[PDB]
Design a protein around this ligand. Sequence first.
Ligand SMILES: CCCCCCCC/C=C/CCCCCCCC(=O)O[C@@H](COC(=O)CCCCCCCCCCCCCCC)COP(=O)([O-])OCC[N+](C)(C)C
Ligand SMILES: CCCCCCCC/C=C/CCCCCCCC(=O)O[C@@H](COC(=O)CCCCCCCCCCCCCCC)COP(=O)([O-])OCC[N+](C)(C)C
Ligand SMILES: CCCCCCCC/C=C/CCCCCCCC(=O)O[C@@H](COC(=O)CCCCCCCCCCCCCCC)COP(=O)([O-])OCC[N+](C)(C)C
Ligand SMILES: *[C@@H]1O[C@H](CO)[C@@H](O[C@@H]2O[C@H](CO)[C@@H](O[C@H]3O[C@H](CO)[C@@H](O)[C@H](O)[C@@H]3O)[C@H](O)[C@H]2NC(C)=O)[C@H](O)[C@H]1NC(C)=O
Ligand SMILES: *[C@@H]1O[C@H](CO)[C@@H](O[C@@H]2O[C@H](CO)[C@@H](O)[C@H](O)[C@H]2NC(C)=O)[C@H](O)[C@H]1NC(C)=O
Ligand SMILES: *[C@@H]1O[C@H](CO)[C@@H](O[C@@H]2O[C@H](CO)[C@@H](O)[C@H](O)[C@H]2NC(C)=O)[C@H](O)[C@H]1NC(C)=O
Ligand SMILES: *[C@@H]1O[C@H](CO)[C@@H](O)[C@H](O)[C@H]1NC(C)=O
Ligand SMILES: *[C@@H]1O[C@H](CO)[C@@H](O)[C@H](O)[C@H]1NC(C)=O
Ligand code: BEF
Ligand SMILES: [Mg+2]
Lengths: 374, 1178
Amino acid sequence: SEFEEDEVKNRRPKEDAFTQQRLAAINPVLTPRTVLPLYLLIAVVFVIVGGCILAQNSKVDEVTIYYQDCMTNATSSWSDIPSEHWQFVFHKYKTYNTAPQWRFVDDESDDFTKQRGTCQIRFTTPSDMKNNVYLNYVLEKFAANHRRYVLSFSEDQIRGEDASYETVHDATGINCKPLSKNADGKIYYPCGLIANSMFNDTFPLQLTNVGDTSNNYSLTNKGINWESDKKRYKKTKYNYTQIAPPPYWEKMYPDGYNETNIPDIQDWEEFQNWMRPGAFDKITKLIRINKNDTLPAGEYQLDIGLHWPVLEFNGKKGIYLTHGSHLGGRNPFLGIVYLIGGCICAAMALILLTFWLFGGRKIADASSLSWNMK
Amino acid sequence: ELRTVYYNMPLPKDMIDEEGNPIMQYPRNKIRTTKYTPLTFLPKNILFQFHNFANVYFLVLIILGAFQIFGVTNPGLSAVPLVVIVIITAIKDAIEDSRRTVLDLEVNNTKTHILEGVENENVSNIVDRSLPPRTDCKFAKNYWKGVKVGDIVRIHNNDEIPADIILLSTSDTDGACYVETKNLDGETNLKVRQSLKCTNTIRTSKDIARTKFWIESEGPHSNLYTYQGNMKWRNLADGEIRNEPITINNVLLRGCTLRNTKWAMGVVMFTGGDTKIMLNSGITPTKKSRISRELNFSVVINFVLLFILCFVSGIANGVYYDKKGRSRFSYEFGTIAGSAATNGFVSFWVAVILYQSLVPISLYISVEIIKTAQAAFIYGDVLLYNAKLDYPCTPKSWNISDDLGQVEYIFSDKTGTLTQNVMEFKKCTINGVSYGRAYTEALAGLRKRQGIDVETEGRREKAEIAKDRDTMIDELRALSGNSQFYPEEVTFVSKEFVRDLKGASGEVQQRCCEHFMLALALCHSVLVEANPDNPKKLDLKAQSPDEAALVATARDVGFSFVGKTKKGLIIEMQGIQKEFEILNILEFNSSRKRMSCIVKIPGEPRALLICKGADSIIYSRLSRQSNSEAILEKTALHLEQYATEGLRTLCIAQRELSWSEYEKWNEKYDIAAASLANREDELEVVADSIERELILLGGTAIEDRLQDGVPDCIELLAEAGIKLWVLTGDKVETAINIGFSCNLLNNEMELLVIKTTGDDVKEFGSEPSEIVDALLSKYLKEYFNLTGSEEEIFEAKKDHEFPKGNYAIVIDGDALKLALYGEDIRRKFLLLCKNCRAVLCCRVSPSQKAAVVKLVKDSLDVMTLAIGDGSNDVAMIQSADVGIGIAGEEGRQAVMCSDYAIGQFRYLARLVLVHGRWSYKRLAEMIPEFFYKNMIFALALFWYGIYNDFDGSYLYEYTYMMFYNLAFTSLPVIFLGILDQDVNDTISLVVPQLYRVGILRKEWNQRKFLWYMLDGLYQSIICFFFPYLVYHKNMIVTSNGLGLDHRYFVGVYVTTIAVISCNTYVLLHQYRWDWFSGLFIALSCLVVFAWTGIWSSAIASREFFKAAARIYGAPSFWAVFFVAVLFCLLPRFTYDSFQKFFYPTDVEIVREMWQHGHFDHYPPGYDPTDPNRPKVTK
Ligand SMILES: CCCCCCCC/C=C/CCCCCCCC(=O)O[C@@H](COC(=O)CCCCCCCCCCCCCCC)COP(=O)([O-])OCC[N+](C)(C)C
Ligand SMILES: CCCCCCCC/C=C/CCCCCCCC(=O)O[C@@H](COC(=O)CCCCCCCCCCCCCCC)COP(=O)([O-])OCC[N+](C)(C)C
Ligand SMILES: CCCCCCCC/C=C/CCCCCCCC(=O)O[C@@H](COC(=O)CCCCCCCCCCCCCCC)COP(=O)([O-])OCC[N+](C)(C)C
Ligand SMILES: *[C@@H]1O[C@H](CO)[C@@H](O[C@@H]2O[C@H](CO)[C@@H](O[C@H]3O[C@H](CO)[C@@H](O)[C@H](O)[C@@H]3O)[C@H](O)[C@H]2NC(C)=O)[C@H](O)[C@H]1NC(C)=O
Ligand SMILES: *[C@@H]1O[C@H](CO)[C@@H](O[C@@H]2O[C@H](CO)[C@@H](O)[C@H](O)[C@H]2NC(C)=O)[C@H](O)[C@H]1NC(C)=O
Ligand SMILES: *[C@@H]1O[C@H](CO)[C@@H](O[C@@H]2O[C@H](CO)[C@@H](O)[C@H](O)[C@H]2NC(C)=O)[C@H](O)[C@H]1NC(C)=O
Ligand SMILES: *[C@@H]1O[C@H](CO)[C@@H](O)[C@H](O)[C@H]1NC(C)=O
Ligand SMILES: *[C@@H]1O[C@H](CO)[C@@H](O)[C@H](O)[C@H]1NC(C)=O
Ligand code: BEF
Ligand SMILES: [Mg+2]
């Protein structure tokens, strides 16, 4: 009855070089006859390159003078700069000495007793500097790389906007936090610590030829920054009634901003140079350039108006006059390190060849396998 | 815990919980093999993820930042990477567990037949013919999950049993039933279950509907050999209780399969987790690979380095903020603030945020990607796919592939994994003449060890055997027309046998052979039933497969066993049928090791007592007067030979009995059989009377066929250094037979048996657990010099070399109970098996298999692998570092509850060796490398702190800090972790000794991790201080003289050096340089340059607005670039060359041999374990 009724009632994986782990490949086994030539190739030509770099680096001649002690050490009469303040490097003339001179011309009209007057610096160059002469300024011990300092500016104000107070003060990440607005309630136009503390010394638009003043060497503040930077820096759209100068720019703008005097930060390449803070403790920024004429051998004078204080923090400020290299200034590191690398490669090649000629084994030895020995 | 089950009866008042619902609830009949429950997936998975310490670090950083905010802030996008990575890992784990769920569902939806029309009260004579019959009562098709305690179930032939049920009645009158228990133990025999005597007369749904009863049972106790219950009903003539005791003999368990039975009817007692197989199973653990735990320790070392950096940063920053004459007092509006210690505290926690990257967020997602891809490449392997089952190697667990590279011990189930369940009559010795040609793979391996080139020898011998076989079949057909002769199933290959059965060796040999085959066709318990498809075909239904093999050979040679009359059997001899008359049958017994039949020989007729039994049992019952005493020694020699070849052997002896003798023995046996009070020993003494005299006429030899390539795979894994222990639930003798075939056990090898036997109980001690201890200590002191002591186990942990000495341990389950009981004897047992190249634990329960794996795993901290089919190996397999299930034609719980599932045992080698080696290596190289690469980048932030007074400005632009680990340096290390091969798969199977490295754990340590950390530290120094030393003199690094001073531009210098150094380092530590990984290395470097270009060209990056143009146009950048990459890569490359040249590793030597063509004669996909294997030149 019920029992009778109950009685009555592919995956093969794809064969493929990829899925079967059989891709086309080389298996590099390193043997001395392939490794030692590589070592020698690297050695030989890292030595070529290091020698060429060191050779082209010796040709770099430069002038450095730290004038931070000009108000107190210099006098009203021409006096040699102490040896600790200058460094000359001329490669045709390795025994120069010929100390530079400086003179302090005080300005009692100015009431900033910390930095005032003009430092006149006379230096003699025995050689010519190429047709592309850079007058940089150096700062020592000014820290432009601290956490709050380095984020203290408005990108909205750099980009030409008439940024609100909240846009300027309460922006995520970078914002000009301690310096966004003055006690009256006007927004600082270049807000932030970076713009406030802009280097202030006035550099001349020429090098006075002390011998023949009929031909003075001319310098420019145009072309001292990348030109593409004018795509990022824009002339502001503020209205001179919304903005005020930074706190430390108030000797520059005693009345404040008004109709004509607002700075054009697009044309102001010193401002754009300062707004790029230095990564390290020594800060070099281009301030003057001559792309036309060679600076012939002779004695020149540089008159710097002193407005920026450094002696509070034992800092230094100086001038650095160069023509440069393709690798930058004069720095022997790259050549020394290319030569060291070539010599280390050659030494390892020789050491391995020596260890091979004496304790060199046989290559394809199934007898040296761990199990065939034990 | 006693549970009463009422059928067709209302539950008593005390058993109901007040609302028509019984108190006791019984678990659903559903099986669960998933790691997680649907409601426990998220807590458990997130906890598993947060057992990685770097995840707790990431969580802590975000939490701390958000409540406090402090420096940097910008919360919202800070918590996103961790949440995304945790969600993605949870999704991967859920997809894995969903595959397991699909298999569970398939098992749960299996069909059963459950009685309908009678309400199951338990879960929301005896039969009364007077009660009205209900037609709606029928056995309805249902699912396995629909089965509940108290349901009446009807199981058809070859139907798997859905729950633990008690047999009520079977289609056979008297209620006998056969079950296949290969799943619950290793038994190859069918087990006879018996139905209860009272319910035997019930064989319809209607009778079972009119019936009432209730069973009082004990609870579920996970002892496969014990059950105790009591069925109680009321007599329908007289109202009173009648009780029937239920043994394990009446019970069908969930793992078994009904066999040779039309149907079997029973009542369910246990369901789901209450069944004995599920009580042995366990709950499918979440396995973490070994390298992952060691990775936790590596991450902690990285935490310590980060703490030291942040401590230095905070202290130096406080010391600086205490100073005077600083530009911050003039230009930053800076004031010296009180509590310089709390300012050092703020600086510490600013530095923690600065140096976050030191612990990389991409580490765990990268390891998970690599492991998932490794599992996918295992699954996509075509040499791991079994065409016959249509089954690829399926990874069940997608994170433990590198465990397969470190395996030292393989624990193997003997039946159904090592062996295919096929028995073949191979050889037979008749009158001291051996017949049968056989060429195993075991003999091929022995002879290969001997030296003989066994490719040519084996193929030639197989051709000889096939030719002899065809000759034999044609000569058989010509000898006579046999109705049941089917040549497609012949396994006896003796040409000489049939060529001798006519005339060859003389008429005495003629008659000896004929009578031997006739006695094989007479003395047996095989049943013949017509094939369903072919009416003329017979199917030879037998309880023992060896008996079926013997009768099948007797049929093929021309002594066919057909049908069964009321008396005797009809045997077709050479095509002429004659029925015999069976006087008596003395059944086979586990206690007798012998079967016997008595036949009538016509005249005054005579009796013929034919006795079939084990070689020693029969040899003991033999005549001194008569036996040729030459046939005796020849037969013993043949049987020893056969047993060495791994064949189970029997002897057969006939005694001719005078009529007088048989009348007396028949009547004595009749009294003994009618006698009550344990008639068993009555029949024992009477059968002992009759059988003590016998004339040995011959012996047989049946092979239990192993799977293909099992001795080859075992020898490969032994050359790799892996020890194989065989744990069986089957008898010792079968395990020893299998061992010889496997080549695990050879002649000239000592068998250390840990017998707890009474006769040697007389010798060693008083009673067991003293005698197991005595035997362990005696073997330990005798054959080796060491005893079980903590220092000896300590010293044994140190050496992983394969054991020498030619000893093999043989323990049964009784002795293993004692040897695993106490800690000191556990030490002694582990030490005796740590030597002793072969270990066979026979007659062992699933709990004991798991216990042995755990003993080897805990003592001797080592990687283990368990492989098997069935529910014993479920417990063995879950408690192992890698559990492997072997897949069959039907669903298996060992396959469901495993990590990998292969179609054949033979894949172990190819899968285990190739994949294991690649994974162990791929992960090893990948994980220090990761920590190396990240480290370079991150450490430059710390070096920049030396110059910013540890204040906390960043050297890097923020897009660099995300795209370094996301895009610039991720893919090289990931593809090294997924696609790296040191040698190809052919060499991995040709040189299995390359595996030993993973056993020794040479590839991965914390020493190598610290060396990579030191290299990353050195290279971070180079990457930061070479750009710094290019800047430091005058800060002018450009030809034009324009400024490149911004820290983001120095960071571009640093970052380009770090990326190209990192990627070239990763490429140099790759063994194989394929077009794919190389393409993506080149792309990673190009991507750093291309991102700088694309991002800079935009006004969106405010201070990085032209970093690409200005920096990549500078010859300074390229000068430092080349020399810094040289100085970063040179020390390590020089170390690697000095190492390859003077202290090469074995893989280095093997790759040199590879380049010189030592492996050029091997085909690309080369399986040395494959039987259909193309001959290799040398
Ligand atoms: C288009 C991309 C290139 C394609 C390449 C192929 C990619 C495939 C390979 C993948 C390997 C794994 C890579 C690691 C992932 C994290 C990267 C990282 O460094 O996180 C950084 C932040 O990252 C962000 O802030 C991104 C902001 C949006 C969220 C994007 C999720 C990132 C990937 C989620 C996972 C997705 C993986 C899913 C794959 C199945 C954190 O590091 P840090 O910045 O140094 O620390 C400072 C913290 N800070 C940033 C807050 C200051
Ligand atoms: C949503 C899907 C859930 C399933 C429901 C769908 C139902 C149908 C959908 C069916 C589609 C199933 C495809 C899933 C991929 C693996 C499957 C597989 O075959 O594994 C194999 C093992 O081999 C491996 O180990 C592969 C490694 C895992 C890759 C998947 C990781 C997911 C990444 C997460 C990143 C998160 C990304 C963030 C955005 C989401 C074994 O599997 P199988 O048992 O042998 O069966 C597969 C072949 N068959 C099907 C023909 C029999
Ligand atoms: C890519 C560009 C760079 C992008 C960078 C991104 C990062 C780098 C990414 C790199 C990815 C590279 C890995 C390739 C995957 C292996 C391929 C393979 O062998 O096929 C196998 C895949 O088996 C499957 O069924 C499908 C699963 C494939 C993907 C699963 C892992 C993905 C890894 C991501 C991890 C997931 C997230 C993990 C979260 C923790 C087998 O296929 P089959 O057997 O031939 O199919 C036949 C099926 N049949 C049997 C029914 C017939
Ligand atoms: C050139 O740059 C100088 C540094 O940026 C700047 O010095 C700053 O000058 C202002 C005056 O405008 C000083 O302001 C404070 O001076 C005293 C002393 O505390 C207070 O009584 C004032 O009310 C005011 O707080 C700054 O202290 C001073 N900065 C430093 C670092 O000394 C010069 O003014 C600049 N000169 C020109 C010509 O622009
Ligand atoms: C070169 O520079 C010098 C100094 O700046 C110029 O000399 C000055 O000339 C003005 C008017 O001629 C005088 O009032 C100053 O007294 C001069 N200063 C000195 C130091 O001599 C000179 O004119 C410049 N040369 C040319 C060609 O213009
Ligand atoms: C080098 O010569 C060029 C060409 O005359 C000078 O550039 C001009 O400078 C004047 C400023 O006096 C500008 O008004 C012109 O627009 C510039 N012309 C061009 C084409 O740029 C430059 O000043 C000279 N440099 C020096 C140091 O004298
Ligand atoms: C000039 O400097 C020197 C040393 O640098 C010092 O000895 C001397 O006192 C200084 N002169 C004046 C006037 O301060
Ligand atoms: C704007 O302010 C400057 C400050 O020097 C002053 O010289 C100028 O006269 C002002 N503008 C007008 C229109 O007067
Ligand atoms: F299947 Be085994 F014999 F435990
Ligand atoms: Mg099994």
